Amino acid sequence: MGVDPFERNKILGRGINIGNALEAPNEGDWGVVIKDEFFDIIKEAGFSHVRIPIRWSTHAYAFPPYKIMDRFFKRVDEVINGALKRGLAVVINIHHYEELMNDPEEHKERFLALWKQIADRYKDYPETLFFEILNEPHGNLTPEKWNELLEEALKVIRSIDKKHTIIIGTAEWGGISALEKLSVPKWEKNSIVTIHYYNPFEFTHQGAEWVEGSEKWLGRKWGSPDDQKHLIEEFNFIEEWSKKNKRPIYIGAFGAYRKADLESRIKWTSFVVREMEKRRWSWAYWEFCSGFGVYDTLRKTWNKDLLEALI
Ligand SMILES: OC[C@H]1O[C@@H](O[C@H]2[C@H](O)[C@@H](O)[C@@H](O)O[C@@H]2CO)[C@H](O)[C@@H](O)[C@@H]1O
Ligand SMILES: OC[C@H]1O[C@@H](O)[C@H](O)[C@@H](O)[C@@H]1O
């Protein structure tokens, strides 16, 4: 048996995503390779956990039993244990499984087979390891289809592991837009709800090369009293949903891209953290050392003003 999800949310506390790493097609393709020293660096700065985006789908066969490939599995073990060695808690997920988003019907059983294998693999790992069902469900994996798939995933996971806390995200890309449509089974009592926060999207994502039409936002600033008032109102809505449904909240990803002016990024980041903490939510900054990075792996220095904002 596990622990009260609010206790495990407290255990998560402040975290950071190590992104553009294991969620790319191959680790290193998007610019980051998880170095073991990264865990000393993150723990020493004061973080309580790390979130590790993992694209298991490109490292598992496409035909039954959809076995995850040996070498990749060993690599993930090395990352998880590297973080556990420093006393960091760890969130692992299934990230960028695009076929599942485009054709959930056809990939439902493969997705559940991946969780069967991941849960089997780590069922005896420490209680500070968290299982995040699926990053940003979207597209044809509609709010309605997600509520059904997540319940199926929970059944699969819980059939093997009654100890680890599970993290459940929202549909429509995992933000607040489909939160009110999310439904977590009453029988599950060991889960945390996660939401990604990048609002205002045009500000956080301005110039993002992977977002169509983002060039039209370059230069946009953030920081007026109305900007602050609007963020607060959105957080208030999340808080109330949490209160109503009785589920802890984890803001699993939030951050502003390097193209936005530094001062607005710092202002936006420092402000989001202050407002999440007031609400006692756990969270993970997006991300450690890449395009939204706070740590420069070459110089081995942190962007001190941005770190200060995260603390
Ligand atoms: O899709 C590729 C891009 O991903 C970007 O990170 C995403 C992350 O995968 C999402 O889950 C969510 O958190 O938003 C992030 C930022 O849009 C990544 O930063 C880019 O470099 C990738 O090209
Ligand atoms: O709202 C749509 C956007 O959601 C973001 O979380 C993704 O990173 C973008 O790729 C996507 O275009």
From TrEMBL:
Domain Glycoside hydrolase family intervals: 28-289
Keyword RNA-binding included in the entry's annotation: no
Pfam families in the record: Cellulase
Organism of this sequence: Thermotoga maritima (strain ATCC 43589 / DSM 3109 / JCM 10099 / NBRC 100826 / MSB8)
Lineage, opening ranks: Bacteria, Thermotogati, Thermotogota, Thermotogae, Thermotogales
InterPro entries from the UniProt entry: GH, Glyco_hydro_5, Glyco_hydro_5_CS, Glycosyl_hydrolase_5
Top-level lineage group: Bacteria
Protein name: Endoglucanase
GO MF, one annotated term: glucan exo-1,3-beta-glucosidase activity
Family membership: Belongs to the glycosyl hydrolase 5 (cellulase A) family.
Keywords from the named record: Glycosidase, Hydrolase, Signal
A biological process from GO: glucan catabolic process
Gene3D superfamilies: Glycosidases
